């Protein structure tokens, strides 16, 4: 019973991600970060229902502070969809001098691979969405439920020992003709690509990964 899903949101994600970026301290090699475009795409995840339970008490606890009869789905989610983020960056070349040059440059984050247990909780009628952990996370080996609150995943006491939710991700960069020869530029671009990779994964973890969640 592994029955699919396919599908303003894009603009909301764009402005939020933009805020995140504008609130990030930048290395010497990048002057400016901005989201040129965000696109969730046309292709969605393969969804398998794993279990269905009462919502986690942590949700109720959250509501009781600021924000009965309700429901929660434990889902296995397998994503190899067509999400695309296009980010504008001002690459700073420091090879000769400091701030020798600035190249407007555009990076493309694409081809996101994901295979993870998430949860979707209806609590009348706020909606909670959170990615718990990757499918092949070692904390699932001893063959016990994820929804165990005293268990490793939900307790979130050892974030280091968690497998990354994002399995794969592709970053490309568009630079000028003129710079494809110079190794210094290529190196700076590499550094920027790595930095943006870690930044984006960080953002996703802070927005979607348990104990964080998307609240509606």
PDB file of C-alpha atoms in Angstrom:
ATOM      1  CA  UNK A   1       0.000   0.000   0.000  1.00  0.00           C
ATOM      2  CA  UNK A   2       2.709   2.521  -1.191  1.00  0.00           C
ATOM      3  CA  UNK A   3       0.411   4.902  -3.004  1.00  0.00           C
ATOM      4  CA  UNK A   4       2.151   8.244  -4.378  1.00  0.00           C
ATOM      5  CA  UNK A   5       1.818  12.143  -4.257  1.00  0.00           C
ATOM      6  CA  UNK A   6       2.258  14.956  -6.864  1.00  0.00           C
ATOM      7  CA  UNK A   7       1.272  18.723  -6.906  1.00  0.00           C
ATOM      8  CA  UNK A   8       1.943  31.406  -2.885  1.00  0.00           C
ATOM      9  CA  UNK A   9       3.973  28.558  -1.513  1.00  0.00           C
ATOM     10  CA  UNK A  10       7.058  29.087  -3.652  1.00  0.00           C
ATOM     11  CA  UNK A  11       7.155  32.801  -2.848  1.00  0.00           C
ATOM     12  CA  UNK A  12       6.718  32.141   0.882  1.00  0.00           C
ATOM     13  CA  UNK A  13       9.610  29.667   0.911  1.00  0.00           C
ATOM     14  CA  UNK A  14      11.670  32.157  -1.125  1.00  0.00           C
ATOM     15  CA  UNK A  15      11.210  35.085   1.256  1.00  0.00           C
ATOM     16  CA  UNK A  16      11.783  32.867   4.310  1.00  0.00           C
ATOM     17  CA  UNK A  17      14.986  31.346   2.868  1.00  0.00           C
ATOM     18  CA  UNK A  18      16.049  34.885   1.856  1.00  0.00           C
ATOM     19  CA  UNK A  19      15.601  36.034   5.461  1.00  0.00           C
ATOM     20  CA  UNK A  20      17.701  33.061   6.626  1.00  0.00           C
ATOM     21  CA  UNK A  21      20.446  33.963   4.149  1.00  0.00           C
ATOM     22  CA  UNK A  22      20.444  37.689   4.969  1.00  0.00           C
ATOM     23  CA  UNK A  23      20.792  36.675   8.642  1.00  0.00           C
ATOM     24  CA  UNK A  24      23.856  34.519   7.927  1.00  0.00           C
ATOM     25  CA  UNK A  25      27.377  35.805   8.489  1.00  0.00           C
ATOM     26  CA  UNK A  26      29.267  35.523   5.224  1.00  0.00           C
ATOM     27  CA  UNK A  27      32.898  34.340   4.628  1.00  0.00           C
ATOM     28  CA  UNK A  28      35.442  36.603   2.920  1.00  0.00           C
ATOM     29  CA  UNK A  29      34.798  35.060  -0.498  1.00  0.00           C
ATOM     30  CA  UNK A  30      31.095  35.971  -0.699  1.00  0.00           C
ATOM     31  CA  UNK A  31      29.688  39.480  -0.467  1.00  0.00           C
ATOM     32  CA  UNK A  32      26.002  38.824  -0.932  1.00  0.00           C
ATOM     33  CA  UNK A  33      23.515  35.950  -0.974  1.00  0.00           C
ATOM     34  CA  UNK A  34      19.986  36.227  -2.353  1.00  0.00           C
ATOM     35  CA  UNK A  35      17.334  33.752  -3.544  1.00  0.00           C
ATOM     36  CA  UNK A  36      16.643  34.436  -7.208  1.00  0.00           C
ATOM     37  CA  UNK A  37      13.997  31.749  -7.484  1.00  0.00           C
ATOM     38  CA  UNK A  38      12.493  28.880  -5.542  1.00  0.00           C
ATOM     39  CA  UNK A  39      10.476  26.112  -7.170  1.00  0.00           C
ATOM     40  CA  UNK A  40       8.999  23.088  -5.450  1.00  0.00           C
ATOM     41  CA  UNK A  41       8.427  21.597  -8.904  1.00  0.00           C
ATOM     42  CA  UNK A  42       5.826  19.266 -10.351  1.00  0.00           C
ATOM     43  CA  UNK A  43       7.167  15.975  -8.996  1.00  0.00           C
ATOM     44  CA  UNK A  44       6.368  14.925  -5.454  1.00  0.00           C
ATOM     45  CA  UNK A  45       7.318  12.121  -3.023  1.00  0.00           C
ATOM     46  CA  UNK A  46       6.393   8.459  -2.912  1.00  0.00           C
ATOM     47  CA  UNK A  47       4.467   8.128   0.327  1.00  0.00           C
ATOM     48  CA  UNK A  48       4.013   4.926   2.326  1.00  0.00           C
ATOM     49  CA  UNK A  49       1.891   5.006   5.450  1.00  0.00           C
ATOM     50  CA  UNK A  50       3.810   3.239   8.204  1.00  0.00           C
ATOM     51  CA  UNK A  51       1.736   3.810  11.314  1.00  0.00           C
ATOM     52  CA  UNK A  52      -0.951   5.956  12.711  1.00  0.00           C
ATOM     53  CA  UNK A  53      -1.137   7.112  16.271  1.00  0.00           C
ATOM     54  CA  UNK A  54      -2.212   9.795  18.714  1.00  0.00           C
ATOM     55  CA  UNK A  55      -0.157  12.944  18.125  1.00  0.00           C
ATOM     56  CA  UNK A  56       3.065  13.287  20.120  1.00  0.00           C
ATOM     57  CA  UNK A  57       2.531  14.986  23.435  1.00  0.00           C
ATOM     58  CA  UNK A  58       5.181  17.574  22.498  1.00  0.00           C
ATOM     59  CA  UNK A  59       2.693  19.133  20.082  1.00  0.00           C
ATOM     60  CA  UNK A  60       0.011  19.555  22.743  1.00  0.00           C
ATOM     61  CA  UNK A  61       2.723  20.940  25.024  1.00  0.00           C
ATOM     62  CA  UNK A  62       3.666  23.463  22.347  1.00  0.00           C
ATOM     63  CA  UNK A  63       0.052  24.612  21.979  1.00  0.00           C
ATOM     64  CA  UNK A  64      -0.557  24.815  25.736  1.00  0.00           C
ATOM     65  CA  UNK A  65       2.201  27.437  26.016  1.00  0.00           C
ATOM     66  CA  UNK A  66       1.443  29.842  23.104  1.00  0.00           C
ATOM     67  CA  UNK A  67      -0.727  28.230  20.304  1.00  0.00           C
ATOM     68  CA  UNK A  68      -9.245  16.713  22.810  1.00  0.00           C
ATOM     69  CA  UNK A  69      -9.579  14.516  19.525  1.00  0.00           C
ATOM     70  CA  UNK A  70      -7.009  14.511  16.678  1.00  0.00           C
ATOM     71  CA  UNK A  71      -4.664  12.169  14.630  1.00  0.00           C
ATOM     72  CA  UNK A  72      -1.045  11.592  13.493  1.00  0.00           C
ATOM     73  CA  UNK A  73       0.446   9.764  10.525  1.00  0.00           C
ATOM     74  CA  UNK A  74       3.881   8.201  10.537  1.00  0.00           C
ATOM     75  CA  UNK A  75       5.089   8.241   6.954  1.00  0.00           C
ATOM     76  CA  UNK A  76       7.928   6.715   4.993  1.00  0.00           C
ATOM     77  CA  UNK A  77       8.722   9.398   2.406  1.00  0.00           C
ATOM     78  CA  UNK A  78      10.868   8.770  -0.657  1.00  0.00           C
ATOM     79  CA  UNK A  79      11.690  11.946  -2.638  1.00  0.00           C
ATOM     80  CA  UNK A  80      13.528  12.207  -5.904  1.00  0.00           C
ATOM     81  CA  UNK A  81      11.598  15.168  -7.211  1.00  0.00           C
ATOM     82  CA  UNK A  82      12.381  18.233  -9.234  1.00  0.00           C
ATOM     83  CA  UNK A  83      12.875  20.868  -6.519  1.00  0.00           C
ATOM     84  CA  UNK A  84      15.066  23.764  -7.689  1.00  0.00           C
ATOM     85  CA  UNK A  85      16.639  26.673  -5.829  1.00  0.00           C
ATOM     86  CA  UNK A  86      18.468  29.344  -7.786  1.00  0.00           C
ATOM     87  CA  UNK A  87      20.625  31.552  -5.603  1.00  0.00           C
ATOM     88  CA  UNK A  88      22.482  34.724  -6.584  1.00  0.00           C
ATOM     89  CA  UNK A  89      25.874  35.279  -5.052  1.00  0.00           C
ATOM     90  CA  UNK A  90      28.561  37.924  -5.276  1.00  0.00           C
ATOM     91  CA  UNK A  91      31.783  35.886  -5.376  1.00  0.00           C
ATOM     92  CA  UNK A  92      34.746  37.783  -3.999  1.00  0.00           C
ATOM     93  CA  UNK A  93      38.105  37.035  -5.622  1.00  0.00           C
ATOM     94  CA  UNK A  94      41.014  37.723  -3.315  1.00  0.00           C
ATOM     95  CA  UNK A  95      43.772  35.928  -5.223  1.00  0.00           C
ATOM     96  CA  UNK A  96      45.882  39.039  -5.840  1.00  0.00           C
ATOM     97  CA  UNK A  97      45.098  41.741  -3.186  1.00  0.00           C
ATOM     98  CA  UNK A  98      42.061  41.497  -0.891  1.00  0.00           C
ATOM     99  CA  UNK A  99      38.731  41.952  -2.705  1.00  0.00           C
ATOM    100  CA  UNK A 100      40.475  41.930  -6.114  1.00  0.00           C
ATOM    101  CA  UNK A 101      37.203  41.369  -7.887  1.00  0.00           C
ATOM    102  CA  UNK A 102      33.516  40.667  -7.467  1.00  0.00           C
ATOM    103  CA  UNK A 103      31.793  38.275  -9.863  1.00  0.00           C
ATOM    104  CA  UNK A 104      28.028  38.064  -9.849  1.00  0.00           C
ATOM    105  CA  UNK A 105      27.472  34.320  -9.963  1.00  0.00           C
ATOM    106  CA  UNK A 106      24.488  32.036  -9.766  1.00  0.00           C
ATOM    107  CA  UNK A 107      24.258  28.697  -8.033  1.00  0.00           C
ATOM    108  CA  UNK A 108      21.688  25.985  -8.629  1.00  0.00           C
ATOM    109  CA  UNK A 109      20.693  23.619  -5.863  1.00  0.00           C
ATOM    110  CA  UNK A 110      18.808  20.735  -7.464  1.00  0.00           C
ATOM    111  CA  UNK A 111      18.174  16.995  -7.670  1.00  0.00           C
ATOM    112  CA  UNK A 112      17.383  16.577  -3.979  1.00  0.00           C
ATOM    113  CA  UNK A 113      17.385  12.956  -2.805  1.00  0.00           C
ATOM    114  CA  UNK A 114      15.530  11.982   0.336  1.00  0.00           C
ATOM    115  CA  UNK A 115      14.315   8.791   2.027  1.00  0.00           C
ATOM    116  CA  UNK A 116      13.129   9.346   5.538  1.00  0.00           C
ATOM    117  CA  UNK A 117      10.519   8.862   8.202  1.00  0.00           C
ATOM    118  CA  UNK A 118       8.459  11.969   8.819  1.00  0.00           C
ATOM    119  CA  UNK A 119       5.233  12.632  10.727  1.00  0.00           C
ATOM    120  CA  UNK A 120       2.111  14.606   9.884  1.00  0.00           C
ATOM    121  CA  UNK A 121      -0.062  15.607  12.807  1.00  0.00           C
ATOM    122  CA  UNK A 122      -3.619  16.979  12.854  1.00  0.00           C
ATOM    123  CA  UNK A 123      -4.356  18.790  16.121  1.00  0.00           C
ATOM    124  CA  UNK A 124      -7.660  20.605  15.670  1.00  0.00           C
ATOM    125  CA  UNK A 125      -6.845  22.165  13.471  1.00  0.00           C
ATOM    126  CA  UNK A 126      -3.239  23.172  13.475  1.00  0.00           C
ATOM    127  CA  UNK A 127      -1.148  21.044  11.152  1.00  0.00           C
ATOM    128  CA  UNK A 128       2.283  19.769  12.092  1.00  0.00           C
ATOM    129  CA  UNK A 129       4.852  18.406   9.666  1.00  0.00           C
ATOM    130  CA  UNK A 130       8.260  17.133  10.739  1.00  0.00           C
ATOM    131  CA  UNK A 131      10.964  14.908   9.328  1.00  0.00           C
ATOM    132  CA  UNK A 132      12.047  12.516  12.053  1.00  0.00           C
ATOM    133  CA  UNK A 133      15.054  10.671  10.623  1.00  0.00           C
ATOM    134  CA  UNK A 134      16.521   8.909   7.584  1.00  0.00           C
ATOM    135  CA  UNK A 135      15.146   5.412   6.834  1.00  0.00           C
ATOM    136  CA  UNK A 136      18.473   3.674   7.386  1.00  0.00           C
ATOM    137  CA  UNK A 137      19.339   5.493  10.653  1.00  0.00           C
ATOM    138  CA  UNK A 138      21.191   3.154  13.061  1.00  0.00           C
ATOM    139  CA  UNK A 139      18.782   4.096  15.910  1.00  0.00           C
ATOM    140  CA  UNK A 140      16.250   1.949  14.101  1.00  0.00           C
ATOM    141  CA  UNK A 141      18.444  -1.202  13.981  1.00  0.00           C
ATOM    142  CA  UNK A 142      17.439  -2.651  17.444  1.00  0.00           C
ATOM    143  CA  UNK A 143      13.991  -2.877  15.761  1.00  0.00           C
ATOM    144  CA  UNK A 144      12.013  -0.456  17.878  1.00  0.00           C
ATOM    145  CA  UNK A 145       9.458   2.211  16.849  1.00  0.00           C
ATOM    146  CA  UNK A 146      10.549   5.731  15.968  1.00  0.00           C
ATOM    147  CA  UNK A 147       7.613   7.168  17.904  1.00  0.00           C
ATOM    148  CA  UNK A 148       9.219   6.122  21.143  1.00  0.00           C
ATOM    149  CA  UNK A 149       9.713   9.529  22.908  1.00  0.00           C
ATOM    150  CA  UNK A 150      12.402   8.133  25.195  1.00  0.00           C
ATOM    151  CA  UNK A 151      14.095   6.595  22.165  1.00  0.00           C
ATOM    152  CA  UNK A 152      17.059   8.279  20.442  1.00  0.00           C
ATOM    153  CA  UNK A 153      15.350   9.852  17.421  1.00  0.00           C
ATOM    154  CA  UNK A 154      12.547  11.608  19.244  1.00  0.00           C
ATOM    155  CA  UNK A 155      14.593  12.569  22.282  1.00  0.00           C
ATOM    156  CA  UNK A 156      17.009  14.347  19.871  1.00  0.00           C
ATOM    157  CA  UNK A 157      19.791  14.245  22.489  1.00  0.00           C
ATOM    158  CA  UNK A 158      22.429  12.994  20.035  1.00  0.00           C
ATOM    159  CA  UNK A 159      22.129  15.095  16.814  1.00  0.00           C
ATOM    160  CA  UNK A 160      25.686  14.106  15.823  1.00  0.00           C
ATOM    161  CA  UNK A 161      24.792  10.428  15.636  1.00  0.00           C
ATOM    162  CA  UNK A 162      21.840  11.108  13.304  1.00  0.00           C
ATOM    163  CA  UNK A 163      22.131  10.296   9.607  1.00  0.00           C
ATOM    164  CA  UNK A 164      21.471  13.315   7.391  1.00  0.00           C
ATOM    165  CA  UNK A 165      17.881  13.602   6.178  1.00  0.00           C
ATOM    166  CA  UNK A 166      19.086  14.897   2.821  1.00  0.00           C
ATOM    167  CA  UNK A 167      20.716  11.943   1.066  1.00  0.00           C
ATOM    168  CA  UNK A 168      21.858  13.672  -2.079  1.00  0.00           C
ATOM    169  CA  UNK A 169      21.907  17.204  -3.479  1.00  0.00           C
ATOM    170  CA  UNK A 170      23.442  18.727  -6.562  1.00  0.00           C
ATOM    171  CA  UNK A 171      25.091  22.132  -6.701  1.00  0.00           C
ATOM    172  CA  UNK A 172      26.180  23.758  -9.933  1.00  0.00           C
ATOM    173  CA  UNK A 173      27.548  27.266 -10.470  1.00  0.00           C
ATOM    174  CA  UNK A 174      27.303  29.552 -13.442  1.00  0.00           C
ATOM    175  CA  UNK A 175      30.351  31.706 -13.990  1.00  0.00           C
ATOM    176  CA  UNK A 176      31.726  33.619 -16.917  1.00  0.00           C
ATOM    177  CA  UNK A 177      33.634  32.232 -19.841  1.00  0.00           C
ATOM    178  CA  UNK A 178      36.407  34.399 -18.835  1.00  0.00           C
ATOM    179  CA  UNK A 179      36.968  32.800 -15.486  1.00  0.00           C
ATOM    180  CA  UNK A 180      36.858  29.138 -16.413  1.00  0.00           C
ATOM    181  CA  UNK A 181      40.611  29.130 -16.959  1.00  0.00           C
ATOM    182  CA  UNK A 182      41.797  30.557 -13.653  1.00  0.00           C
ATOM    183  CA  UNK A 183      42.251  28.017 -10.843  1.00  0.00           C
ATOM    184  CA  UNK A 184      41.907  30.643  -8.121  1.00  0.00           C
ATOM    185  CA  UNK A 185      38.397  31.457  -9.279  1.00  0.00           C
ATOM    186  CA  UNK A 186      37.520  27.775  -9.567  1.00  0.00           C
ATOM    187  CA  UNK A 187      38.727  27.261  -5.974  1.00  0.00           C
ATOM    188  CA  UNK A 188      36.717  30.228  -4.670  1.00  0.00           C
ATOM    189  CA  UNK A 189      33.657  28.800  -6.468  1.00  0.00           C
ATOM    190  CA  UNK A 190      34.306  25.427  -4.839  1.00  0.00           C
ATOM    191  CA  UNK A 191      34.504  27.026  -1.391  1.00  0.00           C
ATOM    192  CA  UNK A 192      31.246  28.893  -2.082  1.00  0.00           C
ATOM    193  CA  UNK A 193      29.515  25.733  -3.298  1.00  0.00           C
ATOM    194  CA  UNK A 194      30.497  23.886  -0.121  1.00  0.00           C
ATOM    195  CA  UNK A 195      29.464  26.789   2.082  1.00  0.00           C
ATOM    196  CA  UNK A 196      26.063  27.051   0.371  1.00  0.00           C
ATOM    197  CA  UNK A 197      25.570  23.258   0.616  1.00  0.00           C
ATOM    198  CA  UNK A 198      26.103  23.285   4.406  1.00  0.00           C
ATOM    199  CA  UNK A 199      24.027  26.470   4.793  1.00  0.00           C
ATOM    200  CA  UNK A 200      21.067  24.991   2.915  1.00  0.00           C
ATOM    201  CA  UNK A 201      21.179  21.683   4.827  1.00  0.00           C
ATOM    202  CA  UNK A 202      21.367  23.692   8.026  1.00  0.00           C
ATOM    203  CA  UNK A 203      18.280  25.694   6.992  1.00  0.00           C
ATOM    204  CA  UNK A 204      16.379  22.474   6.174  1.00  0.00           C
ATOM    205  CA  UNK A 205      17.332  20.968   9.544  1.00  0.00           C
ATOM    206  CA  UNK A 206      16.219  24.133  11.370  1.00  0.00           C
ATOM    207  CA  UNK A 207      12.910  24.239   9.467  1.00  0.00           C
ATOM    208  CA  UNK A 208      11.897  20.626   8.959  1.00  0.00           C
ATOM    209  CA  UNK A 209      13.889  18.172  10.953  1.00  0.00           C
ATOM    210  CA  UNK A 210      12.705  17.037  14.390  1.00  0.00           C
ATOM    211  CA  UNK A 211      12.682  18.538  16.934  1.00  0.00           C
ATOM    212  CA  UNK A 212      11.893  21.440  14.547  1.00  0.00           C
ATOM    213  CA  UNK A 213       8.673  21.359  12.544  1.00  0.00           C
ATOM    214  CA  UNK A 214       6.370  23.195  10.132  1.00  0.00           C
ATOM    215  CA  UNK A 215       3.389  24.612  12.008  1.00  0.00           C
ATOM    216  CA  UNK A 216       0.160  25.709  10.318  1.00  0.00           C
TER     217      UNK A 216
END
